[PDB]
Design a protein around this nucleic acid. Sequence first.
RNA 1: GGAGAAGCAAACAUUUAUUGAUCCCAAGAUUACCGAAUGGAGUAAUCCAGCUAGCAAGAUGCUAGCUAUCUAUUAUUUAAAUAAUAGAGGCGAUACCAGGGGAAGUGAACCAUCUAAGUACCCUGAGGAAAAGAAAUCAAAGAGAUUCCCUUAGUAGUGGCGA
RNA 2: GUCUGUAAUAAGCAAAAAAGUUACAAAAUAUUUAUAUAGAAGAAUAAUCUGGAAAGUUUAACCAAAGAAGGUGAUAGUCCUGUAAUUUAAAUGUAAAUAUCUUUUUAAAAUGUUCCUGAGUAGGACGAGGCACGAGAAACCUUGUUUGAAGCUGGGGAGACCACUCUCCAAGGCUAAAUACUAGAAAGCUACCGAUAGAGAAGAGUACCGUGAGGGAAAGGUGAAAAGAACCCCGGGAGGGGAGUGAAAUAGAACUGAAACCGUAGACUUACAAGCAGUCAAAGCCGUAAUUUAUUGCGGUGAUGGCGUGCCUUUUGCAUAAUGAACCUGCGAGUUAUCAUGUCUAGCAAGAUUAAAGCAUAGAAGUGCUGGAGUCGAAGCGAAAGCGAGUCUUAAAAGGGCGAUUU
RNA 3: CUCUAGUCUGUUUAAAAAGGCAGGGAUGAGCUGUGAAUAGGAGUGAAAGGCUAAACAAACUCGGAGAUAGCUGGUUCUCCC
RNA 4: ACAUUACCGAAGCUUUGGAUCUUAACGAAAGUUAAGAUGGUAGGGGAGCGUUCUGUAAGCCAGAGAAGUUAAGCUGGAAAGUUUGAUGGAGGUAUCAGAAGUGAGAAUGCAGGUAUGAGUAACGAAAAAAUGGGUGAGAUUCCCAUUCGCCGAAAACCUAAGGUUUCCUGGGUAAAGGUCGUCUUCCCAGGGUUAGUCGGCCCCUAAGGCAAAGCUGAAAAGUGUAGUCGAUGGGAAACGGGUU
RNA 5: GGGACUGACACCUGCCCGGUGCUGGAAGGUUAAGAGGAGAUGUUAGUUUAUGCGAAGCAUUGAAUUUAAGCCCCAGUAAAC
RNA 6: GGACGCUGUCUCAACGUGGAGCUCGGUGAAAUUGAAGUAUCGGUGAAGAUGCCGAUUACUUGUGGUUAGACGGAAAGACCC
RNA 7: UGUAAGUGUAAAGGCAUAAGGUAGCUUAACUGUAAGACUGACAAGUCGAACAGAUACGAAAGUAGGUCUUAGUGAUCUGGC
Lengths: 156, 114, 66
Amino acid sequence: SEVRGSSKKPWKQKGTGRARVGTKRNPVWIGGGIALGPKPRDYSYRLPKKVKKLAFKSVLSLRAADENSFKVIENFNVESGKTKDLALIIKNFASFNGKVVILLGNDDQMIKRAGKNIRDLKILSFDKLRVVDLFYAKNLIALESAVNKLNEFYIK
Amino acid sequence: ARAKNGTVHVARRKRILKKTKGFWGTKKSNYKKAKDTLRKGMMYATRDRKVRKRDFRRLWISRISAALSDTGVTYSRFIEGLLKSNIKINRKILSNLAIEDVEAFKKIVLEIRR
Amino acid sequence: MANKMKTRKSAKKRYSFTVNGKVKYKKQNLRHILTKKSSKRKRNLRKSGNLSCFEVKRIKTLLPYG
RNA sequence: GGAGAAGCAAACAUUUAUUGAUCCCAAGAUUACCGAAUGGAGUAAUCCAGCUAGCAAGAUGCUAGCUAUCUAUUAUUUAAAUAAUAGAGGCGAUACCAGGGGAAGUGAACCAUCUAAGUACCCUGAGGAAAAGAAAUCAAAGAGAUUCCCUUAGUAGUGGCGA
RNA sequence: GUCUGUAAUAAGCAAAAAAGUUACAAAAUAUUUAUAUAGAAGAAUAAUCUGGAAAGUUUAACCAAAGAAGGUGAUAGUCCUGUAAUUUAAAUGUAAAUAUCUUUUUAAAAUGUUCCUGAGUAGGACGAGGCACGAGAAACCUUGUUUGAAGCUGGGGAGACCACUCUCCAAGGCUAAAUACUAGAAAGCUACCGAUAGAGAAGAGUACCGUGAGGGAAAGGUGAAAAGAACCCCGGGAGGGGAGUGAAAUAGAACUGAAACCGUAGACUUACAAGCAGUCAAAGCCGUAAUUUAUUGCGGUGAUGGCGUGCCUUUUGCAUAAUGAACCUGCGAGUUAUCAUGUCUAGCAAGAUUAAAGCAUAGAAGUGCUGGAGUCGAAGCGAAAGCGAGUCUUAAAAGGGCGAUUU
RNA sequence: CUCUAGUCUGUUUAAAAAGGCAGGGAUGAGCUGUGAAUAGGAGUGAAAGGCUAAACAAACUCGGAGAUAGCUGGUUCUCCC
RNA sequence: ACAUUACCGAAGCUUUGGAUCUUAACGAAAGUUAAGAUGGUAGGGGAGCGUUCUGUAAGCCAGAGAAGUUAAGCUGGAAAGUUUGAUGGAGGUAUCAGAAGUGAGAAUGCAGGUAUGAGUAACGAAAAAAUGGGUGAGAUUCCCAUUCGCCGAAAACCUAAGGUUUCCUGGGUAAAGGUCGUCUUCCCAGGGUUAGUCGGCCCCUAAGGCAAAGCUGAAAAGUGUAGUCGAUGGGAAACGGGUU
RNA sequence: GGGACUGACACCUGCCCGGUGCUGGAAGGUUAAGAGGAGAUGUUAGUUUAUGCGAAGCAUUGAAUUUAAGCCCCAGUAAAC
RNA sequence: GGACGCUGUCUCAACGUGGAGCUCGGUGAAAUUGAAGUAUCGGUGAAGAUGCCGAUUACUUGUGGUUAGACGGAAAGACCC
RNA sequence: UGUAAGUGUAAAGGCAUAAGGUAGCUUAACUGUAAGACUGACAAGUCGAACAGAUACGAAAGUAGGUCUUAGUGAUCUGGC
């Protein structure tokens, strides 16, 4: 019904010697419509908050189980906002040549906009975590501010 | 999300054509005729795998019967004496024996006639 | 909400559900000519009954919410 | 803005550009004829003119500027008649909105009530939104205009109590 | 305050506030590094190896508020265009704020008297329509045909109607935002398409068809750069054979070039034969490898023997002389959104869970909190009142129906 | 000049209704050129259910429309119970 | 026909392996053994192969040759899978998880290409051709000459309705011409249409259309007078010859 | 002027008005809306010791009476079916 | 319906003429088609067999003719339900 | 002789203790129920001891919830009393 064209029967029902047909844009015909094709749809849904919380606890435990890949660094900040300094800090810590996720205990805009450009880096605040990033992160670097805020964030 | 890549039908057809190499006429290249002939051929292959046993046993029996035509022992009586004297040799073995070494088979027959 | 399954009103007005599955209903033949019908027959027709277990699945389809 | 440019594409010649081009943005000028087309008409892009002015004006010459209709407002005995202004005409948006008119293929396993449905379509009006709107309202709660979402709820009711 | 001057109020002038978004209307300014329509600047790689060509391999760096994306002779954060964060406006458009200007108040509370407060209107009767409500006891609203009031000591509504009580004030006119929409202009995103796909159209409402309304296709790819084959030879040309260009000239007007289909060459077989053409046995010949070497294997052909009624639909039953396909290659059919119910998984638990929506963060149609309005359970029985682990039927637990105490 | 009885050819035709033999009318209810008028439940019809753009017991185009079918056809990889 | 002793004969049974499932036992489980049970349309249940896309993946494998096609060989119980040559000249892929426009042999299916009939029917009317010369790479078909034949109320001549460069000159043979072609109404370039008297325009009206006013209709509009258009008609004017 | 049937001309065109149409006729039988409100119902100021009754107002109603055409009915008509 | 005249309508066919047909050169379709190392008879079978059984017959391959069959081709039978 | 007769009504199964014939009294041609079953797709249909109320007959025990049994029937919606 949405392909351009007329809805006239291309030829008579009987007598022509051809296969019966109703409209030119028949899904069978070339250039016609498409039967049972894709239509716009809402893929989003919201999980129960308890399940989401339990998943967060589980992934954090799974990451912290390993001593080397999970590390904690004393609070710092990049007051200059440059990228050299932050990259130096990562390349001092991280070892597994891959995704690195930094956890923060606040919204430190200077660190965030200093790290927005590193190669394989993801900066996350404590209250805005993402399970996919945590789960696939091969190096996980947290501040002790983030540790404390996570403690009262998820103890409740 | 269109999922079209047609590297599948050519694969099926290539395997079928590989197996249908020596067939007559258009049955060796056309997809439809090759598939029809191959499918009936494989069913023939199964049936005939079971039939080969019957065919070969029949051949062995006929060969034994031929090798006994000389003496006066009809081979029903030959199998008779063979069992009765408790010689558990095989139809294939006896058939091959009558060709490779006739005198051993003849001795077996002399021994059966008892 | 675009497509909530509609109940079958003519069935709602006649069927009722018990707590664990059975369906309650009012018996027929006590609505009309009643002089000829025997008294014990009428007394039994008055009291309500339960349907056979063979209709319960279809009725549960007819009354999607009740 | 700075060195090429002569569209979408070069060819092959011939000029333009550091006296700042081409190109881009803004304003302005020109803007044939038709088309609501409106001086009259007509087979749309073409004939016929009137009045004023300029071409040696002139004999079916040429170039310009006015002369259509309707509504509202006044100069009138708003009518007849002009005059004076102001605003409309048509298109777009195979979208949205308001009003007027309003089906049937179908479902009810027929079918006429009913359904499809105030949907399709047609017509008249507008707008950036439209419509509605500051209670002679709701409804048994004490709330306080209209409109749009969430729920009440597939409930209350309604129906050849059939769909 | 009919005229003049006195006790007694109004028409104008000091003293303030609102306004083009309704609430009176019309503008002009400057003013705003506000914004829209051009722009400006914009970071930091060398060597080596293979190769026609490096961006790639390898060894070392450097930039990053810029590792968004394209192009560059193969895959570029540092080669180019750009990107991040900043920023250009004489002229014009649109926005605010400021005054100019405009309009308004030139006062307020204080007690009862007569007046006013929307008329062919409210309502009634008849025929219709809109309310989810199809005349049904049918309210309410709009209306065609008719009839027709009250005037605050009043009137409307409260799902026939009446009373009491409670709420509201019609028959006048205005009003932004939340809302709906994108033909389009700018900037972007994609578990969207990659030339039978995607808009009909990568070249198009064109070709073509119809008197007309209207209907409506097909056709993308040389190379990194034309460096488009100087010249010679056959030929009328076309085309080809050399020479040149190129990494490639079976890239030379076209990448990769499959199948259907058409050939050439070689191996074996075929003119005494009745073959859904295949399968099971099988000598001879040809190719090849072993065991010293003419016998075994793997291969290709195949004299001969046994067996064998294509396939798909539809039927009690099809080789059927029932249907369907000329062949090959592409395209071509249980999907999506919601509700009902069952199962599985995950979480919590007599509790489970938010919907719309809001804030924070960044621009990154995320995910984090906030949001308990509502929904389903926790008590059932009965038409219902009503009573409740009991209730309905009846005076009767007297016996039954449905329950249950065992979630 | 206008029409088509009879017959033959044609009949995957030269022609989506013609051609060869011929036949009827041919001063009239005649033939014909150029314009104009009557439109779908309507037109027109010396009347055949004829004609209205090669299709008419209700034209064509677009839209409702992906109308509805208890009817016919089709529905794509494998294995195990 | 009646007796004696046999044999052949199926995917039945026995024997020899191998696979899955159920039950039971052993075993810590894993698994190992004992028993039986595995034809199958409609239909129900379970387990997998393969395709595309996204995350894993700024990973890994590719200019030392990636995808794709093609040849040979090999493997798994099936879908199917991976090694090596040749071609190809630039992108693909392992594990896990997710999502479908996810698998075609048939619908008198759609689209493209190519067979078959078959080098077969036909090449469009029973008016008719022949020779010589010329041109040219090439002539039954083009040009010219001499004969013959056909139409001659035409198949001739001149104007309409229509077409729109098809007209003339020079050049050309991809294609189109039912053969050939130097030819053509085909293609390319240039040239060609001169009006006071012809036909229009214009002044007139017929058939008819439109239409201020008036009248009637939910709307759009319908009737309709004054007016204005509307030739196939009525209206000022030319003939002969020559020339490209 | 319109419609129906027959179809030059010649001789003729008979019988039936029950059925169904058409024309004319109202004495009755029957009959809608509109007038007409016998009576009945709901509400309650009051009365009734109170129910019951229940004035007025406001509503829901309805018969007897009146009434046209049509039909039945009374005739005619067949070159009306 | 009958008669006369006239005739290849016929007994009864023969010969000649023109265009096709046939051969060669040039151009070059069509419907149709699961394919095909596609014989006959008596049987059998979805009840009429090129494909099955038994038997018989038949060197391989073309061309010009002829339509008995391939329930031939063409039109989702118009008759019937 | 021994039910062949007669049992309102077809036929069948029953009927001597009669379910057949006669007479007296009488209204159980009842209200609420109903364990347990038969037959059954469902909807329905059928039998039923026994219990409370209140009767009829009988001295009483007891019988009677129409008819010797099996046909004489009609769902729902709507409306009336």
